[PDB]
Design a protein around this ligand. Sequence first.
Ligand SMILES: CCN1C[C@]2(COC(=O)c3ccccc3N3C(=O)C[C@H](C)C3=O)CC[C@H](OC)[C@@]34[C@@H]5C[C@H]6[C@H](OC)[C@@H]5[C@](O)(C[C@@H]6OC)[C@@](O)([C@@H](OC)[C@H]23)[C@@H]14
Ligand SMILES: CCN1C[C@]2(COC(=O)c3ccccc3N3C(=O)C[C@H](C)C3=O)CC[C@H](OC)[C@@]34[C@@H]5C[C@H]6[C@H](OC)[C@@H]5[C@](O)(C[C@@H]6OC)[C@@](O)([C@@H](OC)[C@H]23)[C@@H]14
Ligand SMILES: CCN1C[C@]2(COC(=O)c3ccccc3N3C(=O)C[C@H](C)C3=O)CC[C@H](OC)[C@@]34[C@@H]5C[C@H]6[C@H](OC)[C@@H]5[C@](O)(C[C@@H]6OC)[C@@](O)([C@@H](OC)[C@H]23)[C@@H]14
Ligand SMILES: CCN1C[C@]2(COC(=O)c3ccccc3N3C(=O)C[C@H](C)C3=O)CC[C@H](OC)[C@@]34[C@@H]5C[C@H]6[C@H](OC)[C@@H]5[C@](O)(C[C@@H]6OC)[C@@](O)([C@@H](OC)[C@H]23)[C@@H]14
Ligand SMILES: CCN1C[C@]2(COC(=O)c3ccccc3N3C(=O)C[C@H](C)C3=O)CC[C@H](OC)[C@@]34[C@@H]5C[C@H]6[C@H](OC)[C@@H]5[C@](O)(C[C@@H]6OC)[C@@](O)([C@@H](OC)[C@H]23)[C@@H]14
Ligand SMILES: *[C@@H]1O[C@H](CO)[C@@H](O[C@@H]2O[C@H](CO)[C@@H](O)[C@H](O)[C@H]2NC(C)=O)[C@H](O)[C@H]1NC(C)=O
Ligand SMILES: *[C@@H]1O[C@H](CO)[C@@H](O[C@@H]2O[C@H](CO)[C@@H](O)[C@H](O)[C@H]2NC(C)=O)[C@H](O)[C@H]1NC(C)=O
Ligand SMILES: *[C@@H]1O[C@H](CO)[C@@H](O[C@@H]2O[C@H](CO)[C@@H](O)[C@H](O)[C@H]2NC(C)=O)[C@H](O)[C@H]1NC(C)=O
Ligand SMILES: *[C@@H]1O[C@H](CO)[C@@H](O)[C@H](O)[C@H]1NC(C)=O
Ligand SMILES: *[C@@H]1O[C@H](CO)[C@@H](O)[C@H](O)[C@H]1NC(C)=O
Ligand SMILES: *[C@@H]1O[C@H](CO)[C@@H](O)[C@H](O)[C@H]1NC(C)=O
Ligand SMILES: *[C@@H]1O[C@H](CO)[C@@H](O)[C@H](O)[C@H]1NC(C)=O
Ligand SMILES: [Mg+2]
Ligand SMILES: [Mg+2]
Ligand SMILES: [Mg+2]
Ligand SMILES: [Mg+2]
Lengths: 214, 215, 214, 215, 216
Amino acid sequence: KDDDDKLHSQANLMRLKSDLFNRSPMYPGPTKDDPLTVYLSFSLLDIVKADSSTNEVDLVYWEQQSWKLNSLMWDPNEYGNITDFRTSAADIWTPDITAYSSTRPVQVLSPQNALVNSSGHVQYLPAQRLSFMCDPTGVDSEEGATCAVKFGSWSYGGWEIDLKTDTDQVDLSSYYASSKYEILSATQTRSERFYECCKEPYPDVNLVVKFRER
Amino acid sequence: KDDDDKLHSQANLMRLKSDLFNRSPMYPGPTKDDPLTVYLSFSLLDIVKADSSTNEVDLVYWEQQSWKLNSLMWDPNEYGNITDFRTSAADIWTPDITAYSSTRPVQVLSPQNALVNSSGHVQYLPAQRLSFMCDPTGVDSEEGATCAVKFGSWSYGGWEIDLKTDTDQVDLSSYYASSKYEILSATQTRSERFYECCKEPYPDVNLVVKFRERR
Amino acid sequence: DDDDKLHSQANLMRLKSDLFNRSPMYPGPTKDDPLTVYLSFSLLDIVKADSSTNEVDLVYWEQQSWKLNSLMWDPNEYGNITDFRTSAADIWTPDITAYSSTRPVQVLSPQNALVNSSGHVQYLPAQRLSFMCDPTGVDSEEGATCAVKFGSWSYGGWEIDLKTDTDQVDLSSYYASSKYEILSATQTRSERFYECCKEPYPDVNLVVKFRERR
Amino acid sequence: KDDDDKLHSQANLMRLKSDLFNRSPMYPGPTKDDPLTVYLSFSLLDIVKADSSTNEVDLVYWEQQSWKLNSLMWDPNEYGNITDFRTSAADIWTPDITAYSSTRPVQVLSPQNALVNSSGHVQYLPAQRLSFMCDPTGVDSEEGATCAVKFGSWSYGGWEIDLKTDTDQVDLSSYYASSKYEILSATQTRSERFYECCKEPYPDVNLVVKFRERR
Amino acid sequence: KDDDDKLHSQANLMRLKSDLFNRSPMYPGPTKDDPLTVYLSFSLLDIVKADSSTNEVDLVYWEQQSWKLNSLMWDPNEYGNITDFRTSAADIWTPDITAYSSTRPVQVLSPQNALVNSSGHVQYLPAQRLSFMCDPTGVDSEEGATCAVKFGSWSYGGWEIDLKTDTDQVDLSSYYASSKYEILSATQTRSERFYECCKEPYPDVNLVVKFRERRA
Ligand SMILES: CCN1C[C@]2(COC(=O)c3ccccc3N3C(=O)C[C@H](C)C3=O)CC[C@H](OC)[C@@]34[C@@H]5C[C@H]6[C@H](OC)[C@@H]5[C@](O)(C[C@@H]6OC)[C@@](O)([C@@H](OC)[C@H]23)[C@@H]14
Ligand SMILES: CCN1C[C@]2(COC(=O)c3ccccc3N3C(=O)C[C@H](C)C3=O)CC[C@H](OC)[C@@]34[C@@H]5C[C@H]6[C@H](OC)[C@@H]5[C@](O)(C[C@@H]6OC)[C@@](O)([C@@H](OC)[C@H]23)[C@@H]14
Ligand SMILES: CCN1C[C@]2(COC(=O)c3ccccc3N3C(=O)C[C@H](C)C3=O)CC[C@H](OC)[C@@]34[C@@H]5C[C@H]6[C@H](OC)[C@@H]5[C@](O)(C[C@@H]6OC)[C@@](O)([C@@H](OC)[C@H]23)[C@@H]14
Ligand SMILES: CCN1C[C@]2(COC(=O)c3ccccc3N3C(=O)C[C@H](C)C3=O)CC[C@H](OC)[C@@]34[C@@H]5C[C@H]6[C@H](OC)[C@@H]5[C@](O)(C[C@@H]6OC)[C@@](O)([C@@H](OC)[C@H]23)[C@@H]14
Ligand SMILES: CCN1C[C@]2(COC(=O)c3ccccc3N3C(=O)C[C@H](C)C3=O)CC[C@H](OC)[C@@]34[C@@H]5C[C@H]6[C@H](OC)[C@@H]5[C@](O)(C[C@@H]6OC)[C@@](O)([C@@H](OC)[C@H]23)[C@@H]14
Ligand SMILES: *[C@@H]1O[C@H](CO)[C@@H](O[C@@H]2O[C@H](CO)[C@@H](O)[C@H](O)[C@H]2NC(C)=O)[C@H](O)[C@H]1NC(C)=O
Ligand SMILES: *[C@@H]1O[C@H](CO)[C@@H](O[C@@H]2O[C@H](CO)[C@@H](O)[C@H](O)[C@H]2NC(C)=O)[C@H](O)[C@H]1NC(C)=O
Ligand SMILES: *[C@@H]1O[C@H](CO)[C@@H](O[C@@H]2O[C@H](CO)[C@@H](O)[C@H](O)[C@H]2NC(C)=O)[C@H](O)[C@H]1NC(C)=O
Ligand SMILES: *[C@@H]1O[C@H](CO)[C@@H](O)[C@H](O)[C@H]1NC(C)=O
Ligand SMILES: *[C@@H]1O[C@H](CO)[C@@H](O)[C@H](O)[C@H]1NC(C)=O
Ligand SMILES: *[C@@H]1O[C@H](CO)[C@@H](O)[C@H](O)[C@H]1NC(C)=O
Ligand SMILES: *[C@@H]1O[C@H](CO)[C@@H](O)[C@H](O)[C@H]1NC(C)=O
Ligand SMILES: [Mg+2]
Ligand SMILES: [Mg+2]
Ligand SMILES: [Mg+2]
Ligand SMILES: [Mg+2]
């Protein structure tokens, strides 16, 4: 009936995945000769705690990571008109973006699952709680306090992975209104850094947040 | 013989799980062409802590999840008139339902097991302790504090996974009599979210709790 | 005697291979193959009673024991081995939970079971459980009282039956210098029934009367 | 060259590790017909905290375990004259020795790796942080306070696993000079019990620590 | 075309990793007959907390580790002129190197991935947070406190793994300027210790740190 169509779609999905993760090897990761661009964007849910005894602030946020792999492309016509699929992030290569000034291991607040689609684009959007080095002086004033945290590849330079922000403005829309702290401003900026060691540029995305007690 | 029956019974179950799990590849997940409906529900047990300095609350509750897969269906006459069986939750596909509001990784307080039966209905009922953003303010008065947390699939829209609920009434019959906090109202409310960007519905269940200090 | 030692080990490996490799792991109890599990508690310490969260922390040993026909053997075929120790991971274990725990149960002991030729299993693991309790009275003479129910999570009385050896919780191992004194501890079986759905459910109720020491 | 010496070096070890682990099953454990002697010795590094509110003390120490297995023996002449090698603690069998009074799961501060040598002796030294039941009362005085914690096999009796101890003196040579607590005495004593149940003796090693606030 | 080079790139590196890892057995570890030198280097980041009740301190740093294995070499010519690659550190051998005075299990703040190059050199650099035994006394003083922590192999002696440092100067350039505590000095120094038990040396690197409550 109509639900035989349900079967073919299940069968078609299995088949696509098989073609992708079994018939073909897992991605070795970007190389100088296969540079990759990773798009990074932040949405800030809560500032849970600002600790002036340890100088550590706790953020809860979503981090949108996306990038494209030719290895992940397919023609939806051969696979029953499937233009995408959800999958565990264990089954696909994921980038090593990390907070550079984490003071604690990051806690993952969301299922770790990615969306892949026919163009070979991947959307990974992990929700997480980060503790990072922040001195909150003046959080209780009106001018407020400001803390920065940088994100980027741990093991890869600009010639292998390239960071870009699609928007310079941090997304404040889902932030918690009844949170102890209120956001004056938050901005995600991209930078490039150099070392005498090597001529390769090293990108980071610097997250700057201004906030006060509420 | 009584023993011979116990024997056949077992073998039957092994064969049955074998047919589903070994012989067919585990279910790939829902698609638009093959949507899934998940029924949620909540049973309240304890509000353990309300933290005024961080604005977080600790809740201990049962979250009931149900769904149906044709893949899990079988004929009881085929396998010993077995109408249902228990299984480890890692043996079956489970839905990526998550509280969108959590401040700490959820902790599981019970075995992870699911009931499954002949028509392919899965029943999963994890006990959990959750910390989420809430404002305790006013919990020391008569009106109490009201807090809320949204649950829904993290990776899936309403055209793949659709959220539903038995009732709008949270189950308090199991709530801890001696808890530091007493519960005034508790509700589970469904809604669908729509974005500028996309035509697809994004459902959630909204758990709303009204609570105050016990004395 | 060396050879005798080598033959004892060969025998044990062979007995083990027959159960966990020759035949596939027990699917668990059912209506037509029900199981009885005996529970007995031994109370070690009450480490903390928190008045602010209404939580109590306990250290205790939980004796679980049961019979499985698939675990039987005739010692003569196997070098007169009448019992062995095994990793609890290797055998089906009943799913018994504290119903009113407020944290994940912490395991203090190696998880290892005793099996013998009649097919009886004995598993005792030391745990720290924190659960829902009202401490008030703990600073009085009469003392505070708390209770926790233990039973199966996903099985009913028709599949798993609960039973106790005695109604007397064992205090013989209870820490003398503990912050809290144990006035009484009882362990009582009860069956939960419904008008609605016809299958009994069991549980064992650990009730503890305790006060601050003087 | 001096390279060839290194290649045989590696190959003989890979070879030796394979003959023990791959071509032979893992040791089933001690039995009444095949008993094993375990040596337990302690070295104290720190007493981190005494908590007078819960009556628990937190201790950092090395626990040295030694035993000899016939199935770990080899002739050095036959592999490269290799008399010993380091392996992951998970590759071999380990005795299950536990603090009987621990109030939290133990935390390992060190890699888990053992040393094995040609006569079948194994030496395993995990650095651990343990919390055990102790009443700190008197730790602010001159006599200090005294606690004890028994270690032993959880699942095996004296006819299967035989506990012995190196010294009655717990090694203080590595203890931390600047600790909030000074150690007056630390001793490790072997002991055995009997039960109404059985004739088989149960050994434990009793670690008794006397300490007081340094100042 | 342009994308052809891309493929050969991907294929080449999958082939290289296959020859080293799936074709050859993971390295058995150093031996007295095949010893190894690991270099340690420290870059100090934050002293997060100093606990004067328990005398433990919490520290954040990067620890650079490098060694060389002949078994990890290749000719870049046979292999598309790949001169190095990134990999998970679970796929290679890593030295067991522990802070000896740790009071709580080390936490890792970064991805455990390591870089390997055609000469055979391996370079591994985790961020960690360490609780270790230190008495913060006179951290109030303008003169500060002083603490040290030892690092070495847990299971290996000096004839199997020899421990070295590139500079006796700890790298402070990445230190957090707004930290509760300021760094007066940090040194990293190689020690060697003999026991009666054996005539074999046991190396360690000592990290010595003098800090005080920051006043800016
Ligand atoms: C390998 C670990 N990795 C972490 C680093 C760390 O980067 C940062 O922390 C950082 C980056 C930009 C701006 C500020 C940064 N920063 C600080 O330095 C202080 C605080 C932690 C912070 O936010 C990421 C980028 C790069 O790795 C691809 C590094 C650089 C690559 C290259 C550079 O050495 C000159 C540098 C590394 O030192 C090691 C490498 O040597 C092979 C590295 O550890 C980081 O140094 C900042 C830096 C490398
Ligand atoms: C994959 C992660 N996922 C988590 C999200 C997040 O859900 C929520 O946060 C949320 C949902 C319903 C009601 C309230 C929610 N909420 C908030 O938004 C903040 C407030 C405190 C709260 O609890 C749910 C499921 C959906 O994807 C199935 C999302 C939407 C799908 C679609 C939507 O774009 C607007 C939106 C996503 O941005 C990603 C996609 O962009 C193509 C997503 O990350 C979440 O946005 C909130 C939203 C997607
Ligand atoms: C898998 C979840 N499971 C946990 C439950 C939980 O039971 C209890 O918590 C409980 C049982 C007896 C007495 C008191 C109990 N109790 C509470 O209810 C909380 C309070 C702190 C406490 O101790 C165990 C037994 C049974 O499952 C075998 C349950 C019952 C079986 C049946 C019953 O519903 C009709 C009931 C369930 O609601 C769901 C089931 O529907 C398939 C269940 O979730 C638990 O409800 C008590 C109850 C089921
Ligand atoms: C299997 C778990 N195991 C832990 C036990 C418990 O050991 C102790 O805690 C202990 C031992 C000696 C002296 C004092 C002990 N002790 C206390 O019991 C109080 C105090 C907190 C403490 O540390 C040690 C090992 C032994 O079997 C290896 C036990 C005994 C073997 C035998 C004994 O039955 C009485 C007893 C067990 O009950 C189980 C067995 O059933 C036949 C056992 O659980 C422990 O009983 C305390 C006792 C067994
Ligand atoms: C595998 C355990 N191992 C850890 C050890 C532990 O290291 C230290 O604690 C340590 C080492 C050098 C200098 C100071 C150390 N130390 C202290 O001991 C106290 C102070 C806080 C500190 O950091 C590392 C080096 C060596 O193994 C490579 C050890 C020594 C080799 C030899 C020595 O015994 C005579 C000594 C060991 O006792 C056991 C060994 O016998 C197999 C060992 O456990 C450690 O003893 C310190 C010591 C061995
Ligand atoms: C699959 O995913 C990628 C990434 O979202 C899609 O590429 C984007 O598609 C939108 C559609 O308008 C464009 O606006 C974007 O410019 C495209 N790239 C980016 C990063 O902006 C792609 O179209 C999707 N394809 C399918 C079959 O669904
Ligand atoms: C197997 O599982 C399904 C799912 O619960 C059962 O279908 C339910 O049956 C109950 C009892 O009559 C009804 O109240 C519900 O309306 C049904 N579904 C739902 C969504 O609640 C089915 O009855 C079970 N089969 C057996 C063993 O009787
Ligand atoms: C295996 O252990 C069980 C106990 O766990 C033994 O069963 C005991 O049998 C005796 C004699 O009938 C009873 O007195 C005990 O009550 C039983 N145990 C308990 C506490 O229920 C069984 O005998 C052992 N197997 C063999 C044959 O040695
Ligand atoms: C199923 O149940 C019927 C009784 O209702 C029984 O007679 C029949 O034998 C059972 N089927 C099998 C295969 O045992
Ligand atoms: C030990 O074995 C090695 C390698 O075969 C050999 O070269 C060496 O001579 C042996 N030692 C002795 C004393 O024979
Ligand atoms: C192996 O270690 C044991 C325990 O110390 C010892 O008796 C023996 O001398 C050692 N033998 C070798 C080959 O090193
Ligand atoms: C690899 O490592 C060594 C040590 O850093 C370095 O000197 C050598 O140049 C590197 N090989 C290259 C350049 O690819
Ligand atoms: Mg028959
Ligand atoms: Mg013989
Ligand atoms: Mg040769
Ligand atoms: Mg070509």
